[model samples]
Target: MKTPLVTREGYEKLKQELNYLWREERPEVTKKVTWAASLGDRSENADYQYNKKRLREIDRRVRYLTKCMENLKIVDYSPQQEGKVFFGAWVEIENDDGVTHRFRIVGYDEIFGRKDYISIDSPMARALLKKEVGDLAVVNTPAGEASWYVNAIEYV
Candidate 1:
């Protein structure tokens, strides 16, 4: 399996989530499940049934996150990455239609729930890699080939 890529911030976020799930959520849910089970027969006990299912889901996520954290390669910003697009770069691009968009190229795990973050695996990020300001990046999309001119690059 391919190793997962993650930004430093993304790695920290995942670690925090895993910690919360283990120390906080899991224990709380386990308590609820135990209490519900002690109330009555589980076959028709709504609380017990619901909490049991929730426990399974939480365990599944915990396992997945544990494996993902183990395999993740955290990429951090460096001075050598300045002046050009690369992983963990904030990039601004302008299309031929004169529309401009600004986003940061981040790890796959970091893009979720973030509008300004794009995955490095994306075609646009692939095209923008190693590109400097004023350079044109061509991306092949389902619509056709799209072009964008790099307007700015920043590390933070």
Candidate 2:
């Protein structure tokens, strides 16, 4: 997988999640698992089985967060590409039908269900990357091929 460029906000959020997992969730799950195991028959204890599964899930998440934190590269938005698109650039686009949409290309972890916030790996975001303001970005989406004209690019 390509390495994702993350903003300071994105980086801090990931860090917070890692901290929560390590300091809070991990300990809670460990306690639950230990308590359940202590009162258990090896194969028939419901509490043991449930807590064991939950602990494994928590461990899986912790491992993923560890990897993500290790691999993340924090990039502050400076817009050195002039008008061209780059990570953290807020972009405005007008579709062929004259509808305008605004989006900020961001790291995978930072997407939060906003229409304008898109992962940089998305086709639309990929097409917009390295494109200057007022450039046409053509994308072949599952819906169909479409184009959007870039209206503006900003770091903030």
Candidate 3:
């Protein structure tokens, strides 16, 4: 059973995007499509075709976002999560070789287009869960078992 967990900001971001697409973009495209169609020949009308296709794309996205919004659970920062890596925590880790990495543990939907956000379902995040600063987390990668020392943990 996969539960949809998202940060408060992430959930708000999705909601705003869905509303913008449905209310703003969809209305604009529908008007353009309607105006273009009034020219009498839709088959040869580039404006009609483009706006029509855009309408469908926006509808698909809006539909998906609405469904996801209903299921998403917001994980806001809490006092109990302090000093430990948990969902919504910004973690800093370093290996023995001085290769350090910093990222935030977030929900699957929130990881898109973000270089510093790691999915909660990821192997790295899984291994880091519930770990405290100065704790060592061992992640099983395709190469081998990699070890990382937790250098710091904070909530954003």
Candidate 4:
């Protein structure tokens, strides 16, 4: 399997989320499940059913974090990579219509539903990697093929 690249800040953020899930959410869910179990039969109890489902969700997230952490390789964006688009590179791009957008291409686990961020595995990021300023990146989506011109690239 290919290792994922993550910035130090992004790595820390993921770690924090994992910690919260383990230390707070997991324990809270466990308590709720136990309490609900004591009330009656688990099959028909709404509290028990809900808490059980929630616990499963928590476990799924924990597993995802564990697997991601194991395969991730933190990228500190070295000086030599400056001005070139690569994993962990924060890039600014502009469409042909003069609309500009900022995006930091990061690993799968690092994508946190942010509009300005996209996964490194995404088509746009894949097309942008190793490209320099003034280059055009084309992404084919269901809507149509959209293109963006690389305006700038930076590490910080």
Candidate 5:
């Protein structure tokens, strides 16, 4: 099961999106729909159908966010994670083949659309948890078991 966890910033940004959709854009779209409907008959009117559909979509998204936010755990920075790999840490690593990597181990909700972020449940992050700089993280990928040396761990 995917964990219902999010970083503080991730949760805040998600909340802002819901606010913007519900408070700002939702009303504007609603007004547009109303205006289009008042103009004439709803005979394949592009603006009326499009705006109405968008408004419905907006409402659905806002409702989902509001409901899910109550269940999401927002993980903030902790002092104990300063020098080690932990959830929400930006970790840098290197393999013996000289390939360098940098990514944040974050909740599943935060990894979408971000290549630099990875789910905490991923093999690499699972292996890196609790590891400090200079430690080794051996991860199992489809290619094979790969070894990654921890270079740095930072939190924001």
Candidate 6:
């Protein structure tokens, strides 16, 4: 499979999460599981069962983060990317009715918990790619086709 592109910040965030899970959460859960197991009767012990389940979940997430981090290509800002929409570009667009929207094109991994970030693979981002200021991009949404004029483009 192809490695996915990610912003520098996104890469760092994933690394931080992985470190926290491994160094902090995993150890804490292991301690709990050990203590719970020492009490005996694990089948009926809620703490043991819960901690074991949590440990498995944490391990699963750690594995996923490890693989994802290794497969991510971190993209940083470049002066050459100016004047056109590209990965990590902050774009502002205006519709025919003058409704404006501002968003940043980022990786799928980075869009979570961010309302202003859109995945690079999204229809809007795909349509906006390579577009310059004053360029019109037509995006096909579930509602219908919507036209947006690139009001501004910035790389920061």
Query: C-alpha displacement of 65 in model 6, angstroms?
Result: 1.5
Please tell me which model should have the higher TM-score, number 2 or number 5: 2
lDDT of each: 0.81, 0.78, 0.82, 0.80, 0.81, 0.83
Model 3 clashes, total count: 0
Model 4 per-residue lDDT tens digits across residues 1-156? 244777777788788889999998999999998888778896778889998988999899889998888788897766674777776677888866789878888766767766336887778887898887788788887887788888887765
Residue 57 of candidate 6: its Cα lDDT? Answer: 95
Whose lDDT is higher: candidate 2's or candidate 5's? 5
Task: Note the residue pairs that clash in candidate 6.
Answer: none
Residue 92 accuracy (lDDT) in model 4 = 86
Task: Please identify model 3 stretches exceeding 4 Å from their true place.
Answer: 35-50, 112-116, 143-145
Relative to the unseen true structure, what is the C-alpha lDDT of residue 52 in candidate 4, on a scale of 0 to 100?
A: 90
| Alpha-carbon deviation at 58 in model 5, angstroms | 1.2
Candidates in order: C-alpha RMSD to true structure: 2.7, 3.0, 2.9, 2.3, 3.1, 2.7
Give the runs in model 4 whose Cα sits over 4 Å from its true position: 1-3, 114-116
lDDT of 1 by residue, 52-76 (tens): 8989999888888898888889876
Question: Candidate 6 on 12-126: residue-level lDDT in tens?
Answer: 8889989999988998999999989788897889999999999999999888889998888888768774787887788888876779878888888656755446888788988
Q: Point to the candidate with the largest lDDT.
A: 6
Worst 10 residues of 4 by lDDT: 108-117
- Locate the minimum summed-lDDT window of 10 residues in model 1: 108-117
Model 5 scores what on Cα lDDT? 0.81
RMSD (CA, angstroms), candidate 3: 2.9
Where's the lowest-lDDT run of ten residues in candidate 2? 108-117
State in Å the error of residue 74, model 4: 1.0
Better of 4 and 5 by TM-score: 4
The total of clashing pairs for model 5 equals 0
Off by over 4 Å in 1: 1-3, 39-47, 114-116
Instruction: Encode model 2's per-residue lDDT on 2-57: one tens digit a residue.
Output: 65677788777778877888888878878877877677676787877887888788
Q: Give the Cα error of residue 117 in candidate 2, in Å.
A: 3.3
